[PDB]
Amino acid sequence: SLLIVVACALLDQDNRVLLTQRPEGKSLAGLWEFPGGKVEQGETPEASLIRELEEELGVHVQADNLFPLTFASHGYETFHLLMPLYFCSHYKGVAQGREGQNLKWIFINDLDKYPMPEADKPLVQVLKNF
Ligand SMILES: [Mg+2]
């Protein structure tokens, strides 16, 4: 019924945020989005995000370095999405697409230049003003 997904705005030395794009596979190029994933049973939201970032990007993050920013809340035909967004400017590893996905570091004021899922878009506005 209610799906909880956590996401992260990873910030580099130059105030670029990382967006990722699923591979084109057998059809067309997908949308740009914040890295993240489902919050699973027996995991805190922070644990889930930390694991997602390590699985997807080989980026290593400490819970004390994840800061709540905002959340999105979005109705779909068959479930409700609640999506907490964290920011993180202190992490270890070099982001690489470990699941064959595409990576793009984008200056914060430029994020709304890129096609993004409808749910991710209010989150972009919050990032610009912070
Ligand atoms: Mg994942």
Author numbering: 27 to 156
Please share excerpts from the published article on this structure.
Nudix proteins play an important role in regulating the intracellular concentration of nucleotide cofactors and signaling molecules.
The crystal structure includes two molecules of Bh-MutT, A and B, packed together in the asymmetric unit. At the C-terminus, electron density was missing for the last two residues of subunit A and the last residue of subunit B. The structure of each molecule in the asymmetric unit was similar; the Cα atoms of residues Ser6–Phe135 of the two subunits superposed with a root-mean-square deviation (r.m.s.d.) of 0.61 Å. Bh-MutT eluted from a Superdex75 size-exclusion column with a retention time of 68 min, a value that is more consistent with a 36 kDa dimer than an 18 kDa monomer (21-residue N-­terminal tag present). The α-helix of the highly conserved Nudix box in Bh-MutT is one of two helices that sandwich a four-stranded mixed β-sheet with the central two β-strands parallel to each other. As observed in other Nudix structures, all of the polar conserved residues in the α-helix of Bh-MutT are orientated on the same side and are opposite the central mixed β-sheet. A small hydrophobic pocket formed by the side chains of Leu58 and Val64 is likely to play a conserved role in stabilizing the loop–helix–loop Nudix motif. The structure was determined in the metal-bound form, with the catalytically essential divalent cation Mg2+ observed to be co­ordinated to the side chains of Glu57 and Glu61. The similar three-dimensional orientations of the conserved residues in the Nudix box of all known Nudix protein structures suggest that these residues play similar roles in all Nudix hydrolases, binding one or more divalent cations. This is true for Bh-MutT, as shown in the electron-density map in Fig. 4(b), in which the hydroxyl groups of Glu57 and Glu61 are near the Mg2+ ion at distances of 2.10 and 2.11 Å, respectively, which are within the expected Mg2+-coordination distance range.
